[PDB]
C-alpha cells in the first residue's frame, strides 16, 4: 500500500542534523575554555571523555547494525514481489540519502573546520578538539551508515544479495579507509612536514580515498536498472511518453 514510506529517512536526517548542531554549539562553547591546552585537566574533563566514550560506542553501533541486518535478512530473496522489491529499493535510497548527508557532514564541514582550527592554534597533541570531532566522530558515523546501507542492500534486494557490487564495496570501504589514514596524517605532521599547509603530500591519502565517494555513481545506476526492469514495457510507455 505504501511503496514510498520516508519516515525512517526523516527520522535519521533529523537525528543526525540535531546531533551535529549540538556538537557545533559544544565546540563553540568549549573550544577556547578547555581545548587550547592539551595538558590541562579541563582538556581531560571536556574533550578526552568524548573520545573515550565515542570510540567504543561507534564500534558497538556498527557491529550491532551489521548483525541485526544480517539476522533479520530475507531467506527467500529471489521470491520477492515487484511491489515489495520497489519498496526495498526505496528504503535503500533512503539509506543512501542519509549516507550522503553524513558524508557531507564528515568529509566537508569538520574536515575544513580542521584547517581553520589548526591555523588558529599551535598543535600540541594528536587529539585536538577538531581532530576528536572529525576523525573519531564524523568518519565513523558515516562508516556506520555505509555499513547499514550496504547490508540492507545485501540482505533485502536480490540483485545485491547474489555477489558483491563493486561500486557498493568501493563507496562503503574507500571513505572508511580515511580513518586508518589518520595514522599517515599524524606521521606526516610530526616528522615529514613541519608546516600547516593543506596541499602537503601527507594529505594525498585523504584525497585518494575521497575519490571513492564517486563509487556512488555505480550504485545509483545499479538501482536504476532494478527500477527500470520493475516498471516494465507498459510502465515505460507511461514514463517516456
Amino acid at each position: 500500500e505504501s511503496v514510498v514510506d520516508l519516515r525512517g529517512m526523516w527520522i535519521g536526517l533529523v537525528l543526525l542534523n540535531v546531533f551535529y548542531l549540538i556538537v557545533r554549539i559544544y565546540e563553540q562553547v568549549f573550544g577556547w575554555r578547555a581545548g587550547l591546552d592539551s595538558f590541562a585537566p579541563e582538556f581531560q574533563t571536556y574533550w578526552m571523555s568524548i573520545l573515550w566514550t565515542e570510540i567504543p560506542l561507534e564500534l558497538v553501533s556498527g557491529l550491532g547494525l551489521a548483525g541485526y541486518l544480517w539476522k533479520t535478512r530475507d531467506r527467500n530473496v529471489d521470491a520477492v514481489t515487484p511491489r515489495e522489491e520497489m519498496r526495498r529499493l526505496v528504503v535503500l535510497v533512503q539509506w543512501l540519502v542519509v549516507y550522503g548527508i553524513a558524508i557531507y557532514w564528515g568529509a566537508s564541514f569538520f574536515t575544513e573546520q580542521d584547517g581553520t582550527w589548526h591555523m588558529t592554534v599551535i598543535r600540541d597533541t594528536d587529539f585536538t578538539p577538531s581532530h576528536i570531532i572529525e576523525f573519531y566522530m564524523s568518519y565513523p558515523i558515516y562508516s556506520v551508515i555505509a555499513v547499514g546501507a550496504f547490508f540492507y542492500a545485501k540482505t533485502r534486494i536480490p540483485y545485491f544479495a547474489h555477489g558483491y557490487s563493486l561500486a557498493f564495496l568501493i563507496v562503503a570501504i574507500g571513505p572508511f579507509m580515511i580513518i586508518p589514514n589518520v595514522g599517515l596524517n599524524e606521521w606526516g605532521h610530526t616528522f615529514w612536514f613541519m608546516e600547516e599547509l593543506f596541499v602537503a603530500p601527507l594529505h594525498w591519502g585523504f584525497v585518494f580515498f575521497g575519490w571513492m565517494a564517486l563509487g556512488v555513481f555505480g550504485v545509483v545506476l545499479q538501482i536504476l536498472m532494478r527500477i527500470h526492469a520493475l516498471v516494465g514495457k507498459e510502465g515505460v510507455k507511461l514514463l517516456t511518453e
Binding site: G8, I11, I22, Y26, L57
Partner: peptide
C-alpha cells in the same frame, strides 16, 4: 557538561534503534 556530547550520541543511537526497528 563534559558528558553532554557523549549522552547525546547515546540518545541518538537509542532513539534510532527503537524507532527504526518499529518502522
Amino acid at each position: 557538561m563534559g558528558w553532554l556530547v557523549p549522552a547525546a550520541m547515546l540518545a541518538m543511537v537509542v532513539i534510532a534503534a527503537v524507532t527504526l526497528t518499529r518502522l
